[PDB]
Amino acid sequence: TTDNTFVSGNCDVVIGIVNNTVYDPLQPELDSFKEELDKYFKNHTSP
Amino acid sequence: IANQFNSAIGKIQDSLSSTASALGKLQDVVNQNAQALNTLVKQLSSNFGAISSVLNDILSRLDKVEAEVQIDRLITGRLQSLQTYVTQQLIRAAEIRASANLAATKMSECVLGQSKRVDFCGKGYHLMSFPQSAPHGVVFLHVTYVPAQEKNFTTAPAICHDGKAHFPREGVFVSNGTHWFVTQRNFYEPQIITTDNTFVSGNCDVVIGIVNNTVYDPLQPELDSFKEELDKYFKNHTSP
Amino acid sequence: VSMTKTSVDCTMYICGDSTECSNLLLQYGSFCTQLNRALTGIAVEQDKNTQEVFAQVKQIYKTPPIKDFGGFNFSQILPDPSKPSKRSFIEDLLFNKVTLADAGFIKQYGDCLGDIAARDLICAQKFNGLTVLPPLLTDEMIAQYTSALLAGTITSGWTFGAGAALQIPFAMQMAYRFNGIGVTQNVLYENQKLIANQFNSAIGKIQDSLSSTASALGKLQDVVNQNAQALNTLVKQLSSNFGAISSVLNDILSRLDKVEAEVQIDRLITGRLQSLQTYVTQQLIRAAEIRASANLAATKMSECVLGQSKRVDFCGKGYHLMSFPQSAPHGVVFLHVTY
Amino acid sequence: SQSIIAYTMSLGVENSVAYSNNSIAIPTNFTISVTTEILP
Numbered sequence: 001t002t003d004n005t006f007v008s009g010n011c012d013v014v015i016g017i018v019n020n021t022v023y024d025p026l027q028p029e030l031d032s033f034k035e036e037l038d039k040y041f042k043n044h045t046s047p
Numbered sequence: 048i049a050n051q052f053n054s055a056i057g058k059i060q061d062s063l064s065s066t067a068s069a070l071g072k073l074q075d076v077v078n079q080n081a082q083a084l085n086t087l088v089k090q091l092s093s094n095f096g097a098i099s100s101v102l103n104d105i106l107s108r109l110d111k112v113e114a115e116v117q118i119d120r121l122i123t124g125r126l127q128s129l130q131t132y133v134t135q136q137l138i139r140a141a142e143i144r145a146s147a148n149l150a151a152t153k154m155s156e157c158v159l160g161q162s163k164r165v166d167f168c169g170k171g172y173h174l175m176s177f178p179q180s181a182p183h184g185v186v187f188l189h190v191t192y193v194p195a196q197e198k199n200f201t202t203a204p205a206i207c208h209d210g211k212a213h214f215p216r217e218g219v220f221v222s223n224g225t226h227w228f229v230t231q232r233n234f235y236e237p238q239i240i241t242t243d244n245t246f247v248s249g250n251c252d253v254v255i256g257i258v259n260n261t262v263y264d265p266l267q268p269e270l271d272s273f274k275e276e277l278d279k280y281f282k283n284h285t286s287p
Numbered sequence: 288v289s290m291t292k293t294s295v296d297c298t299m300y301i302c303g304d305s306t307e308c309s310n311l312l313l314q315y316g317s318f319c320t321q322l323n324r325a326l327t328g329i330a331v332e333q334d335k336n337t338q339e340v341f342a343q344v345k346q347i348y349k350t351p352p353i354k355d356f357g358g359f360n361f362s363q364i365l366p367d368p369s370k371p372s373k374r375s376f377i378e379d380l381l382f383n384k385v386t387l388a389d390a391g392f393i394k395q396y397g398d399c400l401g402d403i404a405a406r407d408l409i410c411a412q413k414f415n416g417l418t419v420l421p422p423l424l425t426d427e428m429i430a431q432y433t434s435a436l437l438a439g440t441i442t443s444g445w446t447f448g449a450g451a452a453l454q455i456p457f458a459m460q461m462a463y464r465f466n467g468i469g470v471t472q473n474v475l476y477e478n479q480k481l482i483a484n485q486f487n488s489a490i491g492k493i494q495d496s497l498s499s500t501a502s503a504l505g506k507l508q509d510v511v512n513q514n515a516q517a518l519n520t521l522v523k524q525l526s527s528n529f530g531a532i533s534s535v536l537n538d539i540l541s542r543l544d545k546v547e548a549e550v551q552i553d554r555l556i557t558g559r560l561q562s563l564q565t566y567v568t569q570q571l572i573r574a575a576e577i578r579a580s581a582n583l584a585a586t587k588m589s590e591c592v593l594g595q596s597k598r599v600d601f602c603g604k605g606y607h608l609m610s611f612p613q614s615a616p617h618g619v620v621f622l623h624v625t626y
Numbered sequence: 627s628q629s630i631i632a633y634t635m636s637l638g639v640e641n642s643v644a645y646s647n648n649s650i651a652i653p654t655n656f657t658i659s660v661t662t663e664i665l666p
């Protein structure tokens with residue numbers, strides 16, 4: 001995760017770097033607020 | 048911190064100005080070399096069984112072949128006196144090497160660095176040290192943080208909040224009896240227990256002596272301020 | 288940490304109870320004062336070594352009457368009240384391994400008045416002016432200082448080294464120690480009963496080792512044996528003739544007149560004075576090894592008991608958590624605890 | 627009224643540490659101390 005790791009530079013310079021995802025704990029905490037916010041506009045469009 | 052350092056360097060002036068005995072480790076080394084040379088000189092006055100101690104009195108009173116037996120005892124006894132003095136000085140010089148290698152190690156680890164070694168650079172947590180010259184020696188003025196005015200607190204190994212168990216990242220949990228805080232271990236500076244001060248592992252079943260308290264998540268008021276903003280704006284946008 | 292204090296009365300060794308030998312010994316000047324001075328220097332250095340190793344606390348900590356150390360069982364390394372000299376259970380095992388050869392205590396002459404005096408060398412050493420002297424700290428006082436170092440460690444961790452003792456729960460002290468070796472403190476708490484069982488079992492193996500083998504304390508018995516052997520060798524040089532007509536001083540003085548006797552007594556003086564200067568040279572060189580070991584033992588007391596050491600293999604083989612000091616005859620034992 | 631006394635030496639002042647399974651002492655303040663060490 002972005003809490004367990006720190007960034008520096010890009011994939012070209014580090015000998016033996018591997019590709020994997022890095023999870024960001026901020027992302028579901030705002031995507032849950034996103035689908036709920038779309039529901040809140042859907043309720044307000046309903047009447 | 049500056050006033051305390053300046054005051055403590057003040058006590059070093061006053062102590063060294065007042066007492067006689069503070070440099071005993073150096074004065075004793077001068078006294079041993081002085082006593083060993085005084086002994087080696089006094090030892091010349093011995094007969095070792097010759098008719099005199101004074102080499103010229105033997106040669107003033109005896110012929111070329113009766114003198115040899117008197118002179119050879121003085122040679123034997125004086126040669127044994129030097130072999131003794133030089134053996135004593137070699138053994139002492141090993142104690143002075145050991146002290147110089149310790150002093151060189153303290154110069155490197157207490158002056159040129161900061162030492163994690165307990166009591167190596169003075170009694171306390173070592174900050175830094177200052178070397179000073181002395182006759183045949185070195186003085187180190189070691190500077191140490193000593194913790195001073197303690198309070199008791201109730202404590203726990205972990206906080207339980209959400210079935211999840213929380214531990215400090217750095218520092219220790221404390222309670223004044225009504226509220227729980229996290230503090231750095233060597234200086235009381237309490238903070239609200241948060242997801243930035245703590246980390247989670249396992250669940251509250253395994254930790255012996257865990258306690259229940261809330262854990263603040265500082266993302267929540269940044270989403271709640273953003274929620275009441277949205278709710279008012281939806282109530283406004285139902286009005287036109 | 289130390290070796291036996293000896294003092295040798297130069298006149299009683301060289302010239303035992305003869306005045307007309309003592310009047311020749313005076314012609315050699317300062318040598319008997321040099322020998323006394325050198326042996327007194329060694330003897331004072333043995334108390335200094337023991338003070339630098341054990342007297343590292345100026346305050347005498349008591350362990351609590353409750354024993355809630357989070358499952359860790361120090362009862363085998365803390366004092367046992369039920370025995371008059373107040374040592375711990377492992378210190379009594381240590382104290383029984385090293386068989387001493389005098390400690391200077393009250394050898395009150397009537398012991399040296401029997402068949403007992405014939406079977407032992409301590410009376411022969413004493414009668415030839417060789418005397419062992421007692422250490423300044425008794426084994427009671429070493430056990431008290433060791434108890435205070437240990438009670439400070441289990442109740443307050445490293446804090447009594449650096450300042451006032453600050454209490455901390457033992458399982459929280461072990462958590463600070465786990466972070467010290469780079470292992471995250473939840474790894475202690477989620478395993479605390481296993482970490483306590485592995486510690487309690489490992490202290491059990493220390494007893495089983497010390498109780499079974501004869502050889503575990505060999506480094507301390509070697510120091511006792513070298514001191515006793517150097518005194519026995521010094522006593523046996525009183526049987527050498529050094530080219531005199533007899534080795535026994537009173538035989539020369541009964542069999543020869545004042546002129547021819549002094550030619551014979553001078554050989555015994557020369558050989559015996561050379562035997563003492565040999566012994567005191569061996570003892571001064573030895574004392575420098577015992578000092579070097581004491582300054583190391585004091586450095587392990589400071590860095591392994593009063594702290595946690597990052598120095599690899601300095602406080603036992605492993606990552607160092609903590610160490611417990613135990614007193615032994617003329618020495619210290621460290622029980623190093625390692626992850 | 628001055629005389630030589632003889633005594634068993636004190637090893638240090640006695641102190642029971644206030645240990646408990648849930649008590650900690652934490653320093654609210656510090657002293658910066660300077661101490662002299664002398665080596666030949």
Ligand SMILES: *[C@@H]1O[C@H](CO)[C@@H](O[C@@H]2O[C@H](CO)[C@@H](O[C@H]3O[C@H](CO)[C@@H](O)[C@H](O)[C@@H]3O)[C@H](O)[C@H]2NC(C)=O)[C@H](O)[C@H]1NC(C)=O
Pocket residue numbers: 019
């Ligand atoms: C690690 O992840 C990288 C991103 O997915 C990946 O880089 C991409 O690799 C492909 C295949 O080697 C390259 O493919 C393109 O390359 C050129 C055009 O630039 C064309 O000749 C090819 O036909 C094709 O279009 C990508 O250029 C490259 N992209 C980037 C941003 O570097 C790595 O290959 C991955 N490595 C491993 C070992 O998993």
Ligand SMILES: *[C@@H]1O[C@H](CO)[C@@H](O[C@@H]2O[C@H](CO)[C@@H](O[C@H]3O[C@H](CO)[C@@H](O)[C@H](O)[C@@H]3O)[C@H](O)[C@H]2NC(C)=O)[C@H](O)[C@H]1NC(C)=O
Pocket residue numbers: 223224225226
């Ligand atoms: C344990 O530490 C706590 C934090 O220092 C402390 O709680 C705090 O207590 C004070 C009063 O002593 C409160 O002060 C505020 O009180 C009202 C709030 O409306 C105002 O009129 C005052 O101006 C002042 O701001 C704090 O609000 C309170 N903090 C919290 C988080 O509740 C405890 O009192 C301490 N307990 C012990 C036993 O010492």
Ligand SMILES: *[C@@H]1O[C@H](CO)[C@@H](O[C@@H]2O[C@H](CO)[C@@H](O[C@H]3O[C@H](CO)[C@@H](O)[C@H](O)[C@@H]3O)[C@H](O)[C@H]2NC(C)=O)[C@H](O)[C@H]1NC(C)=O
Pocket residue numbers: 207258259
């Ligand atoms: C810490 O906070 C916990 C959550 O509030 C709390 O756990 C709850 O404890 C009670 C009492 O032990 C349990 O009560 C139920 O337990 C059984 C049924 O499982 C019945 O015997 C009881 O009548 C009752 O129904 C709760 O189930 C339990 N809840 C959870 C989520 O575990 C802890 O007790 C608190 N501990 C401390 C020291 O404050």
Ligand SMILES: *[C@@H]1O[C@H](CO[C@@H]2O[C@@H](C)[C@@H](O)[C@@H](O)[C@@H]2O)[C@@H](O[C@@H]2O[C@H](CO)[C@@H](O)[C@H](O)[C@H]2NC(C)=O)[C@H](O)[C@H]1NC(C)=O
Pocket residue numbers: 197198199642643644
């Ligand atoms: C830390 O607490 C200890 C002991 O716990 C307290 O004991 C009572 C005083 C009471 O307040 C309880 O609720 C606490 O749990 C204190 O130890 C005492 O110290 C005084 C001298 O200062 C001594 O007369 C007592 O006999 C001690 N009692 C015990 C059990 O040791 C200690 O003083 C507190 N620390 C600080 C810095 O104040």
Ligand SMILES: *[C@@H]1O[C@H](CO)[C@@H](O[C@@H]2O[C@H](CO)[C@@H](O)[C@H](O)[C@H]2NC(C)=O)[C@H](O)[C@H]1NC(C)=O
Pocket residue numbers: 360362363
């Ligand atoms: C700590 O260790 C000691 C010694 O290993 C345990 O003492 C034994 O306890 C049992 C049960 O009471 C007795 O039958 C034995 O005779 C004890 N042996 C000795 C040498 O005393 C002690 O129980 C342990 N303490 C705890 C709290 O578990």
Ligand SMILES: *[C@@H]1O[C@H](CO)[C@@H](O[C@@H]2O[C@H](CO)[C@@H](O)[C@H](O)[C@H]2NC(C)=O)[C@H](O)[C@H]1NC(C)=O
Pocket residue numbers: 050051654655656657
């Ligand atoms: C920490 O301790 C220092 C002393 O080392 C305290 O400083 C003293 O404060 C009192 C008044 O409270 C003054 O009379 C002294 O003259 C101060 N001494 C110095 C060197 O400044 C300090 O107040 C303490 N701080 C806390 C937060 O307790």
Ligand SMILES: *[C@@H]1O[C@H](CO)[C@@H](O)[C@H](O)[C@H]1NC(C)=O
Pocket residue numbers: 015016017
């Ligand atoms: C590691 O060694 C293998 C051969 O065993 C090689 O194929 C590979 O490219 C090497 N990887 C790196 C990062 O050096």
Ligand SMILES: *[C@@H]1O[C@H](CO)[C@@H](O)[C@H](O)[C@H]1NC(C)=O
Pocket residue numbers: 255256257355647648
């Ligand atoms: C501390 O000790 C008491 C008395 O044995 C016990 O009741 C309590 O549960 C213990 N606390 C912890 C955290 O284990």
Ligand SMILES: *[C@@H]1O[C@H](CO)[C@@H](O)[C@H](O)[C@H]1NC(C)=O
Pocket residue numbers: 280283284
């Ligand atoms: C109410 O909502 C409209 C958009 O629909 C916005 O322009 C207006 O400024 C809002 N007024 C307040 C008081 O928020």
